[PDB]
Each structure stands twice: as structure tokens, then as C-alpha cells.
Design a protein around this ligand. Structure first.
Ligand SMILES: [Zn+2]
Length: 105
């Protein structure tokens, strides 16, 4: 299951518990159709790939997280590791997501 971050404290908590693992954060909105389409594929990915932490952020429930990360496209996937931002992906391209997961893990 992809873990839904609840607030900033929760977000910091998940980043620390990830250790040295790649963390992929799906910034999404409930009005976003592509986000709904890739959502089941992202679920199976998190079930298949325990070597990566998959989080998601509802931009409308966690507005300040979205603004701190200057989100501008829906969806946006942020790639973080050991406290550093490594990469970003705009849009719901699942094959590019898989390629960026492999690149950054
Ligand atoms: Zn709101």
C-alpha cells in the first residue's frame, strides 16, 4: 500500500524511517483524472518493490507540503533519498516513473 502522508510531521516521520531507501512521493489531487488512472499501477508497484518507500500527498489536504515543494503539475512525483531531492516527474507516465525509480534507487 502507498502510505498517505497526513501532515508535515508525518512526512518528516516517513522520511526518517525510510533510512537510506529511495522515497517516491506522489503529489496528487482528487480532481486529477490521470492520477486516478495510474493509482492502481502505483499500488502494485509498492507491493512488488519493498526496496522503495512510496508515499502520496493530497495537495488539497496537505496544502503547505505542496507549496513548500513548489508543485505545479498534477501529478508530480518527487524522488528523495538521504534527505536530498534527487529528481522530479510531472504527469502520470508510469513507464517514465519506473525508469526514474531505477535511475534513483
Ligand atoms: Zn484543502
Amino acid at each position: 500500500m502507498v502510505y498517505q502522508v497526513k501532515d508535515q510531521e508525518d512526512f518528516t516521520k516517513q522520511l526518517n524511517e525510510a533510512g537510506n531507501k529511495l522515497v517516491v512521493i506522489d503529489f496528487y489531487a482528487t480532481w486529477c483524472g490521470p492520477c486516478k488512472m495510474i493509482a492502481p499501477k502505483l499500488e502494485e508497484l509498492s507491493q512488488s518493490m519493498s526496496d522503495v518507500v512510496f508515499l502520496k500527498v493530497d495537495v488539497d489536504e496537505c496544502e503547505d507540503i505542496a507549496q513548500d515543494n513548489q508543485i505545479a503539475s498534477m501529478p508530480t512525483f518527487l524522488f528523495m533519498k538521504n534527505g536530498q531531492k534527487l529528481d522530479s516527474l510531472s504527469g502520470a507516465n508510469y513507464d517514465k516513473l519506473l525508469e526514474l525509480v531505477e535511475k534513483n534507487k
